[PDB]
C-alpha cells in the first residue's frame, strides 16, 4: 500500500526496459553496432564458425543483436552469415579480434564493417 512500510514490494517495470553511432565522449570509448560477414564455400563450416563466435560472444558479455544472413550467389555457391556485435573495450577489442583471427578453421575470411 502507499502508506505501509512495504510500499512497492512487487513493482517490476523499473527492472524491465519496455521499448546507431559510436559512443566516444571523453574516456569510455565504445564501438557501435558491427557486421561480421563470415563468407565460405560451405554451409557447414560457416554455420559452425557462426555458432562458435556466438558462444564466445555470449560467454564474454557481448550484446548480439541479430544473427541473420543474406542470400547466396551463383558462381559454386557462396554462403555467408552476419553476426552483429556491440560491447567492447580497446583491450577487449584487441583480444576479441585476435581470438577471431586465431580461431579461423579453413579459408574463411573476416569482416568487421560497420552498419550501412
Amino acid at each position: 500500500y502507499k502508506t505501509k512500510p512495504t510500499h512497492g514490494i512487487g513493482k517490476y517495470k523499473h527492472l524491465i526496459k519496455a521499448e546507431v553511432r559510436a559512443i566516444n565522449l571523453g574516456t569510455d570509448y565504445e564501438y557501435g553496432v558491427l557486421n561480421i560477414h563470415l563468407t565460405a564455400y560451405d554451409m557447414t563450416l560457416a554455420e559452425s564458425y557462426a555458432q562458435y563466435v556466438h558462444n564466445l560472444c555470449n560467454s564474454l558479455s557481448i550484446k548480439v543483436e541479430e544473427s541473420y544472413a543474406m542470400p547466396t550467389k551463383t558462381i559454386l555457391t557462396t554462403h555467408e552469415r552476419v553476426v552483429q556485435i556491440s560491447g567492447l573495450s580497446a583491450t577487449f577489442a584487441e583480444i576479441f579480434l585476435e581470438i577471431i583471427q586465431s580461431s579461423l578453421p579453413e579459408g574463411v575470411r573476416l569482416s568487421v564493417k560497420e552498419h550501412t
Binding site: 505501509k4 512500510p5 514490494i9 550484446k63
Partner: protein
C-alpha cells in the same frame, strides 16, 4: 504519505543503471529455485510462516 521501510528492501542491491551487463534469467527453473530459498528465509513483514508455522572413510569411499 510514504514511510521508510523497517528492514532491507528486497530487489534493491541489484538495481543498477545497466541491467544488460548483468547476467540474465535464461531458464524457468533458476527462478523457482531462488524463490524457494528466499521463501524459506525469514522476513520482517507478515508471511505465511508466521501464521501457519574421518579421512580414512572418505579415502575408502573414493577408492570404492
Amino acid at each position: 504519505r510514504r514511510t521508510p521501510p523497517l528492514g532491507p528492501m528486497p530487489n534493491s542491491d541489484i538495481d543498477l543503471s545497466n541491467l544488460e551487463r548483468l547476467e540474465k534469467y535464461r531458464s524457468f527453473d533458476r527462478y523457482r529455485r531462488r524463490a524457494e530459498q528466499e521463501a524459506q528465509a525469514p522476513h520482517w513483514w507478515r508471511t505465511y510462516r508466521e501464521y501457519f508455522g574421518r579421512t580414512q572413510q572418505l579415502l575408502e569411499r573414493k577408492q570404492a
